[PDB]
Amino acid sequence: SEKYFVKNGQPHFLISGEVHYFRINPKLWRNHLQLLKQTGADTVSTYIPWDWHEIEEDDFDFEGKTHPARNLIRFIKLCKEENLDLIVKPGPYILAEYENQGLPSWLLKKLSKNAFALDENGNVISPDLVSYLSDEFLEYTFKWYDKVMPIISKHQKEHYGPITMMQLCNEIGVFQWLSGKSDYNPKVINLYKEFIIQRYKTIEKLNSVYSTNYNSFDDLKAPSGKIKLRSDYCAYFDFHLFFREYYNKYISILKNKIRSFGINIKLTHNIPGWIYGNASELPMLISTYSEIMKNHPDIIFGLDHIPEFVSFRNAHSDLACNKILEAMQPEAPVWAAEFQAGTREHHVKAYAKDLETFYIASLAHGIKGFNYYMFSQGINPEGKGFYGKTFYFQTALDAASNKLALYDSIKKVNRFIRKEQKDLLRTNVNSEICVGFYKPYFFTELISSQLLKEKKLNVEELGLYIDPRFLREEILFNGLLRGLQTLNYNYDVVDLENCDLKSLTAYKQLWITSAEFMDAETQNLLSEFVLNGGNLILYPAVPTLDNYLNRCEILKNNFGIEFITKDSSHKVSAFGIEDVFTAFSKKQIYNDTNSKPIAFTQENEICGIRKKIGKGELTILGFAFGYTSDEHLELIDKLVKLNKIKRELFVSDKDIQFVVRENNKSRYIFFLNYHNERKTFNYRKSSKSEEISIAPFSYKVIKENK
Amino acid sequence: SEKYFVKNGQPHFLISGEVHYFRINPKLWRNHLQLLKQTGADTVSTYIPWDWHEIEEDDFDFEGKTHPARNLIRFIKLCKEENLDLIVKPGPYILAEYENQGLPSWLLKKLSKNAFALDENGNVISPDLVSYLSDEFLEYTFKWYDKVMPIISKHQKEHYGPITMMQLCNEIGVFQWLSGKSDYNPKVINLYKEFIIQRYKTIEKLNSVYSTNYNSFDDLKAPSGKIKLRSDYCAYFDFHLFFREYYNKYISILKNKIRSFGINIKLTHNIPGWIYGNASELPMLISTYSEIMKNHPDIIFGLDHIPEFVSFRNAHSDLACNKILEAMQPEAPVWAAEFQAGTREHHVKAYAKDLETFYIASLAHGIKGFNYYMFSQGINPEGKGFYGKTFYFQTALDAASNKLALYDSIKKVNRFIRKEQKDLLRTNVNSEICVGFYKPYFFTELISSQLLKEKKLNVEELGLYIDPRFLREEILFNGLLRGLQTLNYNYDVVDLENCDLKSLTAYKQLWITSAEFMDAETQNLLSEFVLNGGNLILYPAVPTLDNYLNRCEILKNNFGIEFITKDSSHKVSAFGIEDVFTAFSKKQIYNDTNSKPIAFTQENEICGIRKKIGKGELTILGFAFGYTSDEHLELIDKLVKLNKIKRELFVSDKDIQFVVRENNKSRYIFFLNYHNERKTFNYRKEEISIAPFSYKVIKENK
């Protein structure tokens, strides 16, 4: 059942290293490639920068005619001579801390104003930020493709060349994110108007959903400014839906152009979202790719992991991100397109002894392939560095090809991977818990994010109290998922959109973190889940509204629930745990009918119940908790034990993390110490104990035959 | 010349541990105190919560009549029996994750609406947030003081009781910081109007400074909402000055009440500002106490240090805070009133091996005393915790007085401190670099902060491009100060306000991080400094405006500077360093008559010059850099070397931090490894290995 890369009909662990030929003395390219191969890597990865190769308009150099490091053709031939497969990434954007994010200086000087991303006042957001579907931008992008794509096509694996994969552009939308200023370019606003007319057909239908009074579609403007009315929320919701279709149109245009050159290799894209060493916003960015992933089964998305350090402060980010990619892309392996090696920022250190633990933790956490980014340091030639002359620090090789401390860490990890990959790639973890991923709670990058300038969404002005970003960051990502990982309970994540009921029936529990709104399809799905025999844990709210904040009481009615919303102390009791601190004064107070009351407010009013419905079980908690106290871990533990779920190991130190991965042949036990303490502990299988000592911020791996 | 606590006429390192009697079973009070003493700690510290002792209106229990943990008198007696001095903190606010931040529930139910802090519409901001100068709030505070202060008075050291210091209230102004909201209670606004009338005298004078069109003071409304006009910036600037006076009025009323009971012990206050393990906002909180510090030489402010971890990610925060407090409070020792021990937050781990290294780094960085907060965990009685049942985790003792991992680390550090205190407390570092602290750049807690989600200050709307918070956080705190500490160059900080020219002449360089605005007094000070023989480094702007954004070009004119502001690539070259990334497209381009050009834009326009002015030297850079590349460290190193300043040691590993502390007889070398790497190195003016996130201290006789 596992998804993994295959080479010659056998499991293959993809081990790539990033080596920027354009930032390395070409007399040293062969030494970099040999030293990468000698770590057991099978692949090398590089950007092909448009700025570097189209040196002036219609003046192309791929042969080193004008600068030796423009000799892409020679770099491709060296990869083949040194038995490395090649990933190529020709943009048009590369970012890569390259001046203008990779776009030619001559291009950005020549483009007219209507090629750029524009704010609502019509001003350029950034002199290096184009509008993706600008006619002018795509014409010049196509002329760049006309020159680089025949080279890529010629050198594909099917023609005995080394090229196995190509990335389209780079982290689509990472700029509408890192300004939260969204693109109000008129090509964009016109496509949005077409989208709305296609979605609603008549202004009367749009007015019935939004509760607006427009006389025609000509009166409807792109939403801007703060959300003050439920009608503003509806307009922005559709504007988020529109941006997902817009990014799908962009990548669709690039893909159709590439395929016309006879390029049949695997196409990729890369997911941004780590900043300052955690990834709690990454799920919002992956949600922007929802329409690409539905329409392009042949484009594999990989993660850009930037942990910066490896401790309890960020231990849950990589696992929650790996699980959420698997939920949105269940038919392809989970892989890291960019897998931190060294640091992009001199002042933000990357220690070999941290990253080595991150690499092993990533294996425990189900990664199936990765591209060390950056394996080799670079030096920017010709002033091309966005932020300074040196590209990356504390890498595996310096720019001169000297081995640095990280080289032996990568060789060690790669050696274990090559020894074990045949069994390790086929291992699963036994997850008895499924956590639901409700994508619409994530569709807020225009109105609510850690990066956005202006907070545009204030749910209280809409008569709501549960903010979808607060729910998905603090109750779900930093709360439930952090809590389950800390307690060593395995979970899977499932996308609730078009979700097959038969996928959900394998789990002992389904956990749904709900706001006051949820679409009829999902309310119906969860109703059927419980009636047919499922066990559902649902908090902090029974929803009563749909995605447009119109009445939808399907789940409430199907579960026989009556409630009133009342103010009380933040503290509740639940399952006999006193002084559980909850996020809101407002709580759902349930009437006790045909139920067991299991949580109480300070006034002893019922704010949680358990009941039997058809063949299934329902636990509802009308209050919000993440993981900000010890009472929160005790509560998660109690809820898991309601269905007699057990950890795989008894471990004497509750602060040790572990993962058991197994197939029919092999069992791997991964122990992870995310803490600055040398820990001595003992363990045994849940169905004579072994003693282990583990260093600070370190790991152990045990293999068992059978 | 050093400032330090004294005991028996000798230097004394103040070692206190926080132990909340009201959160510990009283059968275990003695065991907690004995275990604290056995670490070498000399003092114990606690709040005395108003809510806990005035159990109903005018019903006081200090003797455990109604709950055994209300026996304050017994706890004071145990402190004396167990040979510990005591710091008491009776509020009225204690915060301390205590319900209602320590105020009685019966008081908050009874107060009239006009006793509360109000929003601009007259709505109560929070049911536990009083107006500091409310007559009804102060009447009830005075009735609390009338019961608790005679007990404190009787138990002073003077009367062979254990009480040696007392804190007034707790983190005054903290609620306005966390919310970004000011108190618009009409009594506060009337005091603001009196402040403005006092400052300007006539509506004509205020109109001339603000460019307003008022016919009288009656037209004048307290500022609110986003700053759109230069006149709104002016009004908000004086609103910040007003709150600094308002906090001084409040602490003065408490102080005078306390002194009326014959309480002659040392009075204290505490400074917050750490967020997620860094402290780049704490200087803004120091700045809120400017008027208290000028008017109360006898109130010692201590720091609340909350590092959470110990690495290169936050290594610079505690030194920069200790140096700024020394600048603002030169006649008292720098001490930590709340010195992290364990963690307030279960999910935010506090490792003994991190905190041990933080404690030794704090000695390197000039700390003279501290109070481990929390030495002892607590259990909230009777649901009185703001949060869950437990108060703090990973402390030295759990609430039951079980020893935890931190206990042995604190005992080890305290043993070293007691062994070395007589000499270590009398050591200083030799700073040849002085960095200017310009308080008006910090006066922004109501309009621009890390906690204020919706920014009210947008300098581009005012025709400015250098934001004072960006400057003070990224160019100063996380840039210059981080860079100097990383490069192992000693610096001192100086308060530029009413600054003595004679004090600046000890230094070989003065570094000024300047926005486009600077008051006439500071422009004149820097003018006189250079003309008299000083070496000034000034960036990223020669200022041309005063604090009210009215023309003021004293420094520009006295230095013969001309410039045009022009847009160019972010990257410049400086002192032959190529590809120096700068924060702004806009840069100052200088006329170079009588000057030497030393920095260039991508098109070779002059964005930095050196010049001789009178007996002194000027280096002006018309661009902003912090520390976000290796070129930035190269540029700081070149600037320091312009005046032949040298590090004290050659250390073979540049990523080892050191501090040399000296007096006439004794030298201490502190080696700090802020990295996850075992490092081996040698040093000279001898080959040593230091574990990850660890330290080594070397003694040299001179």
Ligand SMILES: CO[C@H]1O[C@H](CO)[C@@H](O)[C@H](O)[C@H]1O
């Ligand atoms: C500009 O984008 C870069 O920085 C952001 C913010 O850290 C990352 O999320 C992203 O993966 C990286 O490519």
Ligand SMILES: [Ca+2]
């Ligand atoms: Ca001149």
